[PDB]
Design a binder for this molecule. Structure first.
Ligand SMILES: N[C@@H](CC(=O)O)C(=O)O
Ligand SMILES: N[C@@H](CC(=O)O)C(=O)O
Ligand SMILES: N[C@@H](CC(=O)O)C(=O)O
Ligand SMILES: N[C@@H](CC(=O)O)C(=O)O
Ligand SMILES: N[C@@H](CC(=O)O)C(=O)O
Ligand SMILES: N[C@@H](CC(=O)O)C(=O)O
Ligand SMILES: N[C@@H](CC(=O)O)C(=O)O
Ligand SMILES: N[C@@H](CC(=O)O)C(=O)O
Ligand SMILES: [Mg+2]
Ligand SMILES: [Mg+2]
Ligand SMILES: [Mg+2]
Ligand SMILES: [Mg+2]
Ligand SMILES: [Mg+2]
Ligand SMILES: [Mg+2]
Lengths: 252, 252
């Protein structure tokens, strides 16, 4: 499987997940239907989305690490799948949620070859491959902002900060892309619990890097050894290479 | 002018604002075109929205307090107009922004008779009159949550807090409605600078009250005396009666 196969497969998945979600009424979608393998409830919305995605992915030689159903399959290509990221938004009719896919040539993030985030509410398509990062077919890149007085997405502000603005939308996959295209100057999940799972962030990180962003853990260590398994957890500091170290110092 | 007149006029305005905005490309929309009478730049998108709204409002015996153009007209009915609230979002293709209108029989919020917020990106319609609060025709009401461990919209988190989730979408008009319909358990703008302007909050406050929410200033004081002028500024604590005082204690 190569980066063109991946785009083809992801698009097909985005299409089916969109169909499934849309043909579900809010009152039915918000319902708890079971316990995710991740340890959090699976909403009906999560279930229908994962089903449509898994239906397509089983026809491939891959191992899938997906939020509601855990690890599936045997292949050597590894796929981190968030079938529905921003489920809380989705169930409230709030239009920020996406299906997220990252593909890797091993169970570690450093071997990622394709990242893909499709906003299921707006239809915006983000992906990145060896050629670069795209929003709706157009090349994107991170902003040139050098100042801490900038536009930040941050989980969670636990003190007074210097940012121009702070936002929290409730979907890291999509929010990493907001950073990837330059809409926001930086992205930060600095929650002490390390809440981010591999499928939440893998795609977005990959896209943001292709878009020129520097993306690390809290101390600035590489994300390269982050594993595609249910146990993996992440803190993230993303910014252009000039803003990035200023952020590291700010949270020290 | 009564509460049915206001509904008719607000809907007409929403339709025209959506038309005006949608007919503009992001690259043209995002441009600074002037200085608002509020003291912040007016984007192209802000200007075209305001123009559409003012064409319809100039034909009524009203005084309009609007963000980009300031105070206008001489009528005894006062209208707080945010022609585009969430402009930052709108210019970035982020689908959380609205046009906001509160109508009052005096220049003080205590005499408000109609509240209206129309999401320009999703078409959701929120309003409230003497009969209650509506989302897209359907009656709404705030959540019953009693615990601080709840779903919060808060500007801005500046210390560790007890909430289940924190969200910041960048449009208080819409976010006040998210609270009004129970999607979030509370809404807080506690910024030291007291940043909210009358047209940012008036409608949303009105709708949220009709929905059962208790909505006050920082110290629990009434909002009734808040004036429909450019000088007015607000901090907000909104919740159901049970949750509200717990929040007041939390932020002391
Ligand atoms: N983004 C796809 C459509 C989809 O994935 O739904 C395309 O451009 O064809
Ligand atoms: N991840 C939760 C929110 C949170 O706990 O940050 C959600 O479903 O949105
Ligand atoms: N998924 C959320 C929904 C809610 O808070 O009402 C939870 O139960 O934590
Ligand atoms: N990463 C989790 C937590 C959050 O964003 O609140 C999610 O995307 O929902
Ligand atoms: N919400 C209006 C339509 C609009 O204002 O655009 C209606 O119910 O017809
Ligand atoms: N009102 C600003 C955001 C903020 O200062 O919170 C904007 O949306 O442009
Ligand atoms: N309206 C914002 C836009 C931005 O921050 O890029 C500003 O005041 O500059
Ligand atoms: N633009 C956002 C935030 C702010 O301006 O304070 C609002 O007014 O709702
Ligand atoms: Mg789950
Ligand atoms: Mg998910
Ligand atoms: Mg997730
Ligand atoms: Mg302005
Ligand atoms: Mg505005
Ligand atoms: Mg506003």
């Amino acid at each position: 499987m190569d980066e063109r196969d991946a785009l083809r497969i992801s698009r097909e998945i985005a299409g089916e997940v969109r169909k499934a979600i849309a043909s579900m009424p809010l009152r039915e979608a918000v319902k708890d239907v079971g316990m995710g393998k991740d340890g959090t409830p699976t909403k009906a919305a999560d279930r229908v989305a994962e089903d449509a995605a898994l239906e397509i992915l089983r026809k491939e030689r891959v191992t899938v690490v997906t939020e509601e159903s855990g690890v599936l399959g045997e292949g050597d290509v590894f796929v981190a799948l968030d079938p529905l990221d921003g489920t809380f938004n989705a169930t409230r009719g709030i239009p920020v949620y996406s299906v997220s896919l990252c593909f890797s040539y091993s169970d570690k993030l450093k071997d990622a070859f394709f990242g893909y985030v499709y906003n299921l509410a707006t239809g915006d398509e983000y992906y990145a491959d060896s050629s670069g990062a795209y929003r709706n077919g157009e090349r994107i890149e991170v902003s040139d902002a050098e100042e801490l007085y900038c536009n930040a997405i941050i989980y969670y502000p636990d003190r007074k900060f210097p940012f121009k603005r702070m936002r929290i939308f409730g979907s890291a996959a999509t929010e990493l892309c907001f950073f990837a295209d330059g809409s926001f100057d930086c992205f930060l999940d600095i929650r002490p619990g390390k809440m981010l799972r591999i499928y939440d962030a893998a795609a977005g990180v990959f896209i943001a890097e292709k878009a020129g962003g520097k993306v690390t853990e809290l101390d600035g260590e590489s994300l390269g050894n982050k594993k595609f398994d249910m146990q993996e957890r992440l803190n993230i500091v993303a910014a252009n290479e000039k803003l990035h170290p200023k952020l590291l110092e700010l949270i020290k």
